[PDB]
Amino acid sequence: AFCNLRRCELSCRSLGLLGACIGEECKCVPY
């Protein structure tokens, strides 16, 4: 299985971050 990486990005774009993935679990971070 993959991350919901598009939803992960879109959920953190409102916070000003770039979303990424580890295995199937996602995290976002500032520029």
From Swiss-Prot:
Its main location: secreted. It comes from the Eukaryota. Disulfide bonds join C3-C21, C8-C26, C12-C28. Changing R13A: 1.45-fold decrease in cell death of Jurkat cells. One of its GO terms (molecular function) is toxin activity. The modification Tyrosine amide is found at Y31. It is found in: Secreted. Changing R7A: In r-R6A-R7A; 1.74-fold decrease in cytotoxicity towards Jurkat cells. In GS-R7A; 2-fold decrease in cytotoxicity towards Jurkat cells. Residues 6-9 are annotated as: [R/K]XCQ motif. Keywords: Amidation, Calcium-activated potassium channel impairing toxin, Disulfide bond, Ion channel impairing toxin, Neurotoxin, Potassium channel impairing toxin, Secreted, Toxin. Has the structural arrangement of an alpha-helix connected to a beta-sheet by disulfide bonds (CSalpha/beta). This is Potassium channel toxin alpha-KTx 5.4.
